[model samples]
Target chain A: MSKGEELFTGVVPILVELDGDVNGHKFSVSGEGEGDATYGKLTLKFICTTGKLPVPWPTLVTTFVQCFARYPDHMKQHDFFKSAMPEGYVQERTIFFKDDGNYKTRAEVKFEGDTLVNRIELKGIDFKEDGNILGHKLEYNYNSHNVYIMADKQKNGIKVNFKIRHNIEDGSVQLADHYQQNTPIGDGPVLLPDNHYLSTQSNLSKDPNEKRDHMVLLEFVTAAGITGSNSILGQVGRQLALIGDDICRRYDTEFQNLLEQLQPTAGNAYELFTKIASSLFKSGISWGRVVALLGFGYRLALYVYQRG
Target chain B: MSKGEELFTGVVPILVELDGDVNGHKFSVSGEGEGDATYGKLTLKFICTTGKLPVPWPTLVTTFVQCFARYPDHMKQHDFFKSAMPEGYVQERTIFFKDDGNYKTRAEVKFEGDTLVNRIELKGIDFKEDGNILGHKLEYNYNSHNVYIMADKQKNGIKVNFKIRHNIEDGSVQLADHYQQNTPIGDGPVLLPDNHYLSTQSNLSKDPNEKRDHMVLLEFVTAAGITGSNSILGQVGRQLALIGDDICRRYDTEFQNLLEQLQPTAGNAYELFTKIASSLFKSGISWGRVVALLGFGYRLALYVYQRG
Candidate 1:
């Protein structure tokens, strides 16, 4: 639930732009602390994957701006916590997020020097009392899962609170503050199965309740048994390839076999009859290569001879 | 004696020049004739024997000049029918000649429309012989061996019988009457052995005369000996060419045998094995051959191999 540290922990993933220098597109990940308070500071060492030593700050700024603009409605709810965003000051910047989830903690981005860092937090939400009576209530118990996304767009960005530490004195400082030393690893989460498990032949239904029910069944099927269709296809393809090779080799052998088959039963035919059949057979094969539907012709040949 | 017939007879020879115009070069041939010459009357086409069609005339001219300049004094003697001058003139004249006795006739040059024509003649010696044994003898049986030269140097420009021709003709009505034809079909004769013979051997005498004597012998050795040693050199070169498919055959058969023998068991094993034995077996042949050599090489091996 820690912001900067979670976003850039454990060998932070640095993305490189292939044409980085051309349009000044580059990507990197890192985290640290040190900056203006109202805009709380974080230091990040941007390692451009493209080996572009000096990154373009203007391009990085533009990318961060465009990305945050997409979730304007989602970030509008954070104003209630009274972090008091200043005018013309954006508390949140944009960066790549691998997962979309209702996590207890949410992340925030800030630009420091030429580096980008994400801040995180957790906040309380209304809860229900009874399992069936169904009503809303407020709970403030501290847990590793308490995260809050900013309530609204600030001067330039969104605000975030990670649930890593407790409110020590002003009910602000988070609990388990040391957890901020750890980095967030992983993209979103394991992707759910695309096809419904109960029905082996159809796509999954998109309705929320149906999707949840389908996912449960899919998990059960995968744990119990794996279909052998992929393996069967591989074996079938290999057998067909072997048959193809064998047919081609036999076709080649027939070219020379014609010479041995040529013999004369009539008197003096062996000496007088010129053996030109072998050459004629050669022409047939050469023409066959250019004109015939090779595979079907060979396959049907054996069937025809067997019937005769 | 008739001019324009043959050199052996009394026909006088003439020199012609093709001059350069403001636009390009003009083509012309000159000689003393009895009447006016017409355009398209005689067109000269010079072909290189090596199938090199239409080589640049300037290059050919330069080659002729260089070769003539290299000739020794004896070959350039001033005989009764010819005149010899300074050796350096052969290279000095952009367009001039030091009348060697071999050609017997000379001419000056002038542009006629787009063409070049020689209308001048040198006629002082009486072919009647006067039995006087004067300073020079004449091929002039009134046979028109007119001699004139247009030196590229302005001072030496027109040097033969310019005004002299009108006086001799007693004022002609037309200029073409003085034109004469070339005697030989070709501009030069092929310098080969005549009525001579000898055997070819690896070690030839240091004297060039002896080498020439051997070449002549090779020419006559066999009655059907159309191919000569010069041609052999060309064929062997092609066999060793990297591009050809006949490499192995060329190396194993022709190449190995042609090289000087090497005994693996010889003393001074290191030097014999490493240097002398190997080098003697390489492409040990002359460089920069004339046109005839490459032609001969290709023809000889192809014909001999095909037959045997």
Candidate 2:
């Protein structure tokens, strides 16, 4: 087994505090999150003397801070913030990561009348056993004024993607990592006798010639094999027939439901019919699609007639 | 001369009032802006009972309203507000314009807890002889609680660009339209002596094999009498020569400025040199570009040496 890179074993506490006047608005805001030998969450809070701001200064500060904090992670993917972020602000002090897995970051906030018109770029290389993972992270507050928690991936995976986002605004908290797993339904594909594959049926072909040929071949083969129920070929024929029957049934039901769902606003039959007709024309339904639908209807009728 | 589109001519007063419960926040808000006979400014206001909001609700409300109001005009070019506008809020009334030209519009507020999650799709076409001038306008307050007055076009022309922005937040306003122009510094391109076009020199091939074939001997016959200065080819060549000389001069001056700009950080000669070298390597400077830069540098050096 390939062993993992030795993980950092102790807590590395990161603390930062600030109190002073910024762009004429006296303010104080700060917070910290601990990284247990690996990744850490950073948060901050800013409260300025309110009325003196050029605009709604607190909102601007939150908007700028959340944006500045996320810039390191999000810029590589989208870099949309350059248009919104204020001017004269730039990376003053970048985050530095040590070999032992500890890291520190610094940035001097630039305020244009209490608004952050620039960004402080976070810089660091988070090393792992496979190699070095270069990225920065932040968990800052937006309008919520409280830090929202998010976690780094707990286990390694092969997939990779870069994202640039200032997604934590308006009280929204974003998750940095997400996972999805899709399991096979049933015993994979249905197994058939003699190792034959019983493929799922498909929608009727759009090509008229192809559809006609397919239907003829399927009908002829099934007719030839329907000698007895116990015969292998006969069983295959039955399966094929059942597949066609099922498709016809499902299509008719779905089509009926669609028509019912589009029932007229004033419950008028004519309006509903006109609406459906307009959509049909707008969609430019081909003769092949029409014929396919008609065939399904015909099959449904035949099934009912036989049962009667 | 082509005639312009006939303008709209009357004042269209648009007003809307809202009182509702959204996302557990109760609120009331209203307002409007006048559109003179040609273009109209539209505006609105919102007030939500504060404490129940998920974040600072007022900021969210104002942010969402301004976005929803301007969405129709902005979306075609930028469309950034879709992510932030409140869900279900829609354009209840559209800005209307009349022939001879004035307009108005209204939209019942759509809100889900003070946030504009959905858009108020601006509806209606503004018509002029130019067919239909279809667009919306807004002068909503951001931080000051009152709109600022801006001329339709106080400074004219020579600029162009498309802006994608969420610029109405925190009393900060962003203009999605930007412009640039280039006018000659003086009498533009010089008018040379009548009927004569004097062409400038170029970098000739250095190899004897290449140079000999290019010269082809005859510096006589007045170069086929070279026609008049007004002739297309002569004029084009003279223009081209002037352009080249101007570019050469500008490049040398700009390069000097760039070097000067990079000089002052702690007066670190080695650091500056190392930084320049690293950038050159990373940028993969082409041979042609390097030659161009060196040519400009050489010209500057020659000028300084001669002056001394």
**Top candidate when judged by TM-score against the true structure:** 2
List where candidate 1 sits over 4 angstroms from the true fold: A1-308, B1-108, B114-116, B126-308
Positional deviation of B202 in candidate 2, in angstroms? 55
lDDT of 1 by residue, A59-86 (tens): 1211221111111121211122112111
Q: What is the C-alpha RMSD of each candidate to the true structure, in Å?
A: 31.3, 36.8
Per-residue lDDT of B190-241 in model 1, one digit per residue for the tens? 2221111111111111234432211110000111112332332232222223
TM per candidate, chain B: 0.17, 0.19
What are the lDDT figures for the candidates, one per model?
0.23, 0.27
> CA shift at B178, candidate 2, in angstroms?
29
Minimum summed lDDT over a 10-residue window in model 1 chain A is located at A215-224
